[PDB]
């Protein structure tokens, strides 16, 4: 499913992400924008052999099991294909574990290159929340 901007903002707030570990909504919506372009089915293969999955491009070396990343840790205890669903629940519950890992949203490279220190409030600007 390709989400609309305020449609995803409302789903993420509904699932507890506005100000989760101090990160406003605006940060999370900017992160999904540049990671997957709001498309729950986006996948991208990395040069080390792992793959990134879903709306927030969660990586199979640490976070989910896709059966083709040797040495992977599956810390969110989930098949990576659960991350491609039109229901973002599994993606949001895994992202909550990743932001808590010591480095916050710096774990998402497009958040720190494109979102970090920008006016992220603009991403939730016309929405009924």
UniProtKB/Swiss-Prot annotation:
Give the UniProt keywords, A-Z.
Allergen, Antimicrobial, Bacteriolytic enzyme, Disulfide bond, Glycosidase, Hydrolase, Secreted, Signal
Annotated GO biological process: cell wall macromolecule catabolic process; defense response to bacterium; defense response to Gram-negative bacterium; defense response to Gram-positive bacterium; killing of cells of another organism
Q: Say which enzyme class the record assigns.
A: hydrolase
Tissue range of expression? In the egg white and polymorphonuclear leukocytes.
Q: Where does substrate bind?
A: 101
* Any one Gene Ontology molecular-function term assigned to this protein's record: beta-N-acetylglucosaminidase activity
Q: What is its main location?
A: secreted
Q: Does the keyword field hold Cell wall biogenesis/degradation?
A: no
Which cysteines are cross-linked by disulfides? 6-127, 30-115, 64-80, 76-94
Location(s) in or outside the cell: Secreted
More about this protein:
Lysozyme C is capable of both hydrolysis and transglycosylation; it also shows a slight esterase activity. It acts rapidly on both peptide-substituted and unsubstituted peptidoglycan, and slowly on chitin oligosaccharides.
Assigned protein family = Belongs to the glycosyl hydrolase 22 family.
Q: Its quaternary structure? A: Monomer.
Give the protein's function.
Lysozymes have primarily a bacteriolytic function; those in tissues and body fluids are associated with the monocyte-macrophage system and enhance the activity of immunoagents. Has bacteriolytic activity against M.luteus.
Q: What is this protein called?
A: Lysozyme C
Instruction: Supply the source organism for this entry.
Output: Gallus gallus (Chicken)
Q: Which gene encodes it?
A: LYZ
